[PDB]
């Protein structure tokens, strides 16, 4: 049950912040979602099909795979955009982070005080750097791409090391484990937040 946390760090130009965050967040959500559950009265369930989609980055030499959910992608794009704005406007050293937390709603049989109990946290730290020339910008597109390849490999490797997943829920408790509010896909319950540290 013990909550697991992972931290990733990337250095990027301002114009790459959104794509870098989306690449990481969607890779994690690809692993932390399933098809929509449809229960029968006896407690049996069928599971829908999750589609996936290649996404080319325009500001990074990189491609990531995401779940084919317009709703999920809209939600992530909104908060990532707000994070990028906050980072640009903060007037600091260009340092911030986003956290993606998977949690369960406490069951009555559980001895916890909080109503939301996390079981996985993913934190992506960013440092924004400014470049002087188109030359450097082109190089940065290539190099950030190579770093994101390393980050995705790291995500997959740590995924395999995380043994815990929530118990598959009965019909009465599905909303304690999964976000059932989307049409296409069924993510584990999650919250996204960000901080601006300097």
């Amino acid at each position: 049950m013990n909550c697991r946390s992972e931290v990733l760090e990337v250095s990027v130009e301002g114009r790459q912040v959104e794509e870098a965050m989306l690449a990481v967040l969607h890779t994690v959500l690809l692993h932390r979602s399933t098809g929509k559950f449809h229960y029968k009265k006896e407690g049996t369930y069928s599971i829908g099909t999750v589609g996936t989609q290649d996404v080319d980055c325009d500001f990074i030499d990189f491609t990531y795979v995401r779940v084919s959910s317009e709703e999920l992608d809209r939600a992530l794009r909104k908060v990532v955009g707000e994070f990028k704005d906050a980072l640009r406007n903060s007037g600091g050293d260009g340092l911030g982070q986003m956290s993606l937390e998977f949690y369960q709603k406490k069951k009555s049989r559980w001895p916890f005080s909080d109503e939301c109990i996390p079981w996985e946290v993913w934190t992506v730290k960013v440092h924004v750097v400014a470049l002087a020339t188109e030359q450097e910008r082109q190089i940065c597109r290539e190099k950030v791409g190579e770093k994101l390849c390393e980050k995705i490999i790291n995500i997959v490797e740590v995924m395999n090391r995380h043994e815990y997943l929530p118990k598959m829920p009965t019909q009465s408790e599905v909303d304690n484990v999964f976000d059932t509010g989307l049409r296409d896909v069924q993510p584990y319950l999650y919250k996204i937040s960000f901080q601006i540290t300097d």
């Binding site: 692993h31 098809g35 989609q53 290649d54 084919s68 995500i155 995924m159």
Partner: protein
Amino acid sequence: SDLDKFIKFFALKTVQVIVQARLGEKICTRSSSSPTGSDWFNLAIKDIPEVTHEAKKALAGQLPAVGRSMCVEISLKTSEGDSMELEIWCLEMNEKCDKEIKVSYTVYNRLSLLLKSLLAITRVTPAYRLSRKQGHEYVILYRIYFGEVQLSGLGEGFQTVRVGTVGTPVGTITLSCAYRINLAF
């Protein structure tokens, strides 16, 4: 055995994901709240008929075991005819190296997660961008074989990435990629 069935289709879908990641075209499939007919592991992965044929042909009714691994070789062939191995994807299995396991959906879901990891990783090895840029001075080819793993041909310093592992009552499944990092003639 429902399990032998799971492992067979996991192998077949593994080949589909790798070959489709090397076509030179972005892949896009749709979700469905309703269970789609003959999609496996709750993932929309369309089957290229020719690939299913080569995969079944190589497997020949066998499943991975010690000394018997399913390998997918990705290579580059220049317009002059010279060939170069880029990647070897290896689907391996351990022997009476199992786990006293749970209900069926559990192992099924773990295989599902491994395919999701494969989807991600196939986009971040060097051959991905090479495959997207193929078609003129070179093309990307694939070959499937079943037997002993041979990692020659990948050049000096080739890297290895572990996509993941799945424990089952009959052994541990492992999926990995060995890939060339220096293009050389």
